[PDB]
Amino acid sequence: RPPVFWLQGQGCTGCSVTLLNSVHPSIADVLLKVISLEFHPTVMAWEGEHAIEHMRKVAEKFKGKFFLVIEGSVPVEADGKYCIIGEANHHEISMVDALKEFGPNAAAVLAVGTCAAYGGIPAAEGSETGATAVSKFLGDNGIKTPVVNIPGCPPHPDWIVGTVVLALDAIKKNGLEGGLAEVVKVLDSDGRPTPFFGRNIHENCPYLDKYDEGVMSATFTDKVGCRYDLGCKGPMTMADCFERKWNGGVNWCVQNAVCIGCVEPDFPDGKSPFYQA
Amino acid sequence: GRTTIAIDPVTRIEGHLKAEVVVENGKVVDARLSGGMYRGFETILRGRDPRDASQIVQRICGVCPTAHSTASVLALDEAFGAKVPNNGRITRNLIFGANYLQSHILHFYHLSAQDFVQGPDTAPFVPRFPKSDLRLSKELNKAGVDQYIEALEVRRICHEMVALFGGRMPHVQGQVVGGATEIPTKEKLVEYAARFKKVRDFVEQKYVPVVYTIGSKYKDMFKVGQGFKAALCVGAFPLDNSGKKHLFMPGVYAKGKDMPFDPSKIKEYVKYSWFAEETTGLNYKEGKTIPAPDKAGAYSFVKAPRYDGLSLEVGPLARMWVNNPELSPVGKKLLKDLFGISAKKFRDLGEEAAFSLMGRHVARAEETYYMLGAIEGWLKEIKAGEDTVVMPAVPASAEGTGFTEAPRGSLLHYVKVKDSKIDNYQIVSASLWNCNPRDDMGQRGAVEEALIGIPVDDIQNPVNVARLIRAFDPXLACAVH
Numbered sequence: 001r002p003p004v005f006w007l008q009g010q011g012c013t014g015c016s017v018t019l020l021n022s023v024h025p026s027i028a029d030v031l032l033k034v035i036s037l038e039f040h041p042t043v044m045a046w047e048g049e050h051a052i053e054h055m056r057k058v059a060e061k062f063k064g065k066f067f068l069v070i071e072g073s074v075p076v077e078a079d080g081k082y083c084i085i086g087e088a089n090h091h092e093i094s095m096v097d098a099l100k101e102f103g104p105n106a107a108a109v110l111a112v113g114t115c116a117a118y119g120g121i122p123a124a125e126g127s128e129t130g131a132t133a134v135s136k137f138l139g140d141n142g143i144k145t146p147v148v149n150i151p152g153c154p155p156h157p158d159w160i161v162g163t164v165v166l167a168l169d170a171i172k173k174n175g176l177e178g179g180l181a182e183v184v185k186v187l188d189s190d191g192r193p194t195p196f197f198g199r200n201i202h203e204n205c206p207y208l209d210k211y212d213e214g215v216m217s218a219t220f221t222d223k224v225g226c227r228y229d230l231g232c233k234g235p236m237t238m239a240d241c242f243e244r245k246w247n248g249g250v251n252w253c254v255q256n257a258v259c260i261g262c263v264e265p266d267f268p269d270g271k272s273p274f275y276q277a
Numbered sequence: 278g279r280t281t282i283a284i285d286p287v288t289r290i291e292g293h294l295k296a297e298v299v300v301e302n303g304k305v306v307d308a309r310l311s312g313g314m315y316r317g318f319e320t321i322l323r324g325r326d327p328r329d330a331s332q333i334v335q336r337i338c339g340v341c342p343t344a345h346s347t348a349s350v351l352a353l354d355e356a357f358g359a360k361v362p363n364n365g366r367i368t369r370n371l372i373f374g375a376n377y378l379q380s381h382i383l384h385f386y387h388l389s390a391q392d393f394v395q396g397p398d399t400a401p402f403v404p405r406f407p408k409s410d411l412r413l414s415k416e417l418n419k420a421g422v423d424q425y426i427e428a429l430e431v432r433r434i435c436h437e438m439v440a441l442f443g444g445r446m447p448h449v450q451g452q453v454v455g456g457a458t459e460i461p462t463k464e465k466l467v468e469y470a471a472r473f474k475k476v477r478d479f480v481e482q483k484y485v486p487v488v489y490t491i492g493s494k495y496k497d498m499f500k501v502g503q504g505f506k507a508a509l510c511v512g513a514f515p516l517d518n519s520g521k522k523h524l525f526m527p528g529v530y531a532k533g534k535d536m537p538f539d540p541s542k543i544k545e546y547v548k549y550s551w552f553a554e555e556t557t558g559l560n561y562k563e564g565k566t567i568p569a570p571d572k573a574g575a576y577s578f579v580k581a582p583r584y585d586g587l588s589l590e591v592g593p594l595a596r597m598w599v600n601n602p603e604l605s606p607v608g609k610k611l612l613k614d615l616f617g618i619s620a621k622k623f624r625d626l627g628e629e630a631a632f633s634l635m636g637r638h639v640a641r642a643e644e645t646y647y648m649l650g651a652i653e654g655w656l657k658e659i660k661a662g663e664d665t666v667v668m669p670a671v672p673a674s675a676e677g678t679g680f681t682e683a684p685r686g687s688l689l690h691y692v693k694v695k696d697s698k699i700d701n702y703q704i705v706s707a708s709l710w711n712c713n714p715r716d717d718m719g720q721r722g723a724v725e726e727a728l729i730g731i732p733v734d735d736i737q738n739p740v741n742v743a744r745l746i747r748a749f750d751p752x753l754a755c756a757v758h
């Protein structure tokens with residue numbers, strides 16, 4: 001099982017929580033049979049300078065062989081002060097500091113959530129933290145480590161679990177940088193895996209007929225019509241939520257109310273207002 | 278003598294927390310809590326269609342987004358002058374309630390329990406402190422583990438209960454201004470009730486028992502963490518359409534003395550937080566948020582709230598204390614059987630034990646039962662097919678305020694509209710009441726206080742510093758936003 005570090009920055013802990021809802025494999029199977037989770041501030045036993053030290057050890061042990069998960073965006077302003085993650089050897093660690101230390105020496109970097117991938121909400125209109133997406137941060141610091149974006153706010157568990165597998169299986173088949181090249185190949189222009197984000201919501205919506213008829217809902221609770229007038233953003237969103245649906249399949253966003261296109265790079269500003277056409 | 282320990286990051290919480298304790302004579306004597314990550318939703322939200330708030334503000338926290346959606350729409354409701362259909366009111370309580378269950382199961386099993394249970398021999402459950410203080414038998418500990426593994430599917434199910442009427446979780450789509458966006462069908466009220474019964478059973482049979490079971494091995498823990506012994510509740514889960522009867526009714530308790538709750542006695546101090554000096558002391562309706570990350574002496578992104586100068590605490594204990602409801606069945610038994618104690622209401626636990634490291638864990642296990650009763654009572658009240666939402670008009674200029682109780686304690690959103698766009702939004706959230714630094718008078722935050730006197734026999738293994746903190750169920754994302 002390859003070693004995984006899970007580093008939160010300007011996240012809402014949403015990425016982690018949606019992953020705990022992965023049904024098959026349940027999160028327990030993921031943790032015990034798929035990956036070795038070596039650092040995750042929210043679930044792990046040890047703490048503090050001890051918890052960091054164990055990571056630098058494993059990081060130095062498996063140089064080029066650990067997988068680095070980033071939840072939340074990277075706030076560069078104020079010298080990184082807007083997001084401190086730890087303290088070790090009496091020096092405090094920004095997310096900037098951490099992404100520098102570990103980014104270079106990773107097999108790959110998984111930016112999870114729309115915050116990490118594209119910057120999202122802490123980077124939105126009204127923010128003064130310089131919140132930066134992972135992929136942009138790394139290039140702007142010379143690091144060439146491969147980055148895979150698994151966006152969402154939050155992402156569906158399957159989009160994550162899904163992405164881990166299809167990369168380990170790309171690595172089993174072809175070795176490491178061989179699998180990583182295969183992994184980079186199945187990405188659209190926004191660093192997203194096309195297995196999950198390769199189809200549009202609208203083009204596959206079941207209310208598309210109501211769209212073409214021009215029958216729209218006037219109240220949300222009216223499940224008969226198309227939701228465009230209420231503010232659905234299916235027309236410009238790329239995701240397979242129409243198929244797999246959410247929380248074991250018990251509902252999803254268009255059926256329940258509207259789609260806000262949470263998987264897209266411009267979310268939230270480009271997709272707001274959420275509730276007008 | 279005086280040795281300084283620093284724990285950064287405090288794990289098995291939500292978010293970025295540094296805790297600093299100074300130790301002399303094998304006990305904590307001073308503490309300092311730092312919130313190390315800031316986003317500033319309070320400025321980000323400015324300028325937007327007010328109806329955007331009901332989505333943006335959930336991204337504050339991924340664990341308790343429905344507490345935020347709920348606080349938010351309540352404020353918008355007031356600001357828009359919307360009347361929430363009776364059957365919408367219930368649907369909202371059913372979306373929110375199901376995550377209380379999810380949050381509280383999550384906290385104990387997957388965040389705290391490892392304070393008392395050795396998981397398996399696979400990362401991330403090792404490497405851990407050598408002298409951890411894990412006192413459970415090989416049997417009780419393997420039972421502790423079997424259930425953790427089980428909570429993984431119970432809490433996952435609670436998020437399917439949420440998602441039936443909310444749309445998804447985390448981050449519901451279903452709560453909007455005017456009510457809830459999907460009417461419960463008979464079909465899905467079963468879907469919910471089926472899952473609810475599986476959860477009803479686990480909480481009654483496994484979770485509440487094992488908190489007492491484990492508690493009685495750690496009876497010394499009811500003797501520490503008392504802090505200011507003051508509590509706050511602001512009301513949650515409305516039971517009528519008038520705004521009078523609520524599942525939790527408001528109230529304050531400070532100095533053996535019960536009092537009523539007056540939101541205007543709320544002020545947020547920032548002497549020791551990285552926010553511009555010129556904003557300290559205001560009330561939520563006049564609030565401003567000006568980050569000052571280089572301010573000398575400040576040591577947290579969490580503001581310092583006080584209620585009429587008091588440093589209070591919030592959450593299950595704080596709620597269960599103010600309301601003093603009748604104790605659950607499973608709890609009255611094992612208090613007799615394992616603690617040898619007789620109590621019928623909550624306050625029969627007394628001020629010291631209730632307000633203890635292990636007394637809050639228990640409030641949280643008792644409050645969950647209380648919610649099994651609230652939800653079973655709402656699944657009777659809900660009526661399939663009846664309308665849940667109204668579609669109001671955006672006020673050009675309006676103001677509203679939403680009060681509720683997040684799983685971790687008192688939460689409120691205040692909103693000011695101008696030219697039909699957000700001109701001001703302010704959030705006073707649960708973990709802001711517990712995890713705040715000192716106010717301007719040097720008065721410590723409720724938890725900073727609770728830490729005083731905590732046994733650190735083993736400076737190398739200060740496992741109790743982190744056991745106290747975890748008992749409060751902290752969310753430093755909710756604190757800072």
Ligand code: SF4
Pocket residue numbers: 201202205206207208209211226227228232233234235254259
């Ligand atoms: S606007 Fe929304 S509801 Fe209508 S067809 Fe497109 S995705 Fe479906």
Ligand code: SF4
Pocket residue numbers: 153201237239241242252253254258259260261262263445
């Ligand atoms: S349907 Fe749209 S709003 Fe809902 S989870 Fe998918 S991308 Fe996000």
Ligand code: FCO
Pocket residue numbers: 338341344345380683684685686687688706707708709751752755756
């Ligand atoms: N529960 C929760 Fe989040 C916190 N603290 C809020 O409010």
Ligand SMILES: [Cl-]
Pocket residue numbers: 340341342343344345373376377380683684
């Ligand atoms: Cl919640």
Ligand SMILES: [Fe+2]
Pocket residue numbers: 319580703704705706758
């Ligand atoms: Fe605030």
Ligand SMILES: [Kr]
Pocket residue numbers: 016019020040043
């Ligand atoms: Kr996780």
Ligand SMILES: [Kr]
Pocket residue numbers: 013016017020042
């Ligand atoms: Kr989590």
Ligand SMILES: [Kr]
Pocket residue numbers: 027028031032
């Ligand atoms: Kr596990």
Ligand SMILES: [Kr]
Pocket residue numbers: 027043387
């Ligand atoms: Kr977990």
Ligand SMILES: [Kr]
Pocket residue numbers: 108109148167183
């Ligand atoms: Kr990867």
Ligand SMILES: [Kr]
Pocket residue numbers: 030035160161164
């Ligand atoms: Kr994963």
Ligand SMILES: [Kr]
Pocket residue numbers: 067163164165167168
């Ligand atoms: Kr991976």
Ligand SMILES: [Kr]
Pocket residue numbers: 020043387
């Ligand atoms: Kr977990």
Ligand SMILES: [Kr]
Pocket residue numbers: 386390391394395396421422425
């Ligand atoms: Kr455990």
Ligand SMILES: [Kr]
Pocket residue numbers: 386390394420421422424425487
């Ligand atoms: Kr447990």
Ligand SMILES: [Kr]
Pocket residue numbers: 606607610
């Ligand atoms: Kr019982």
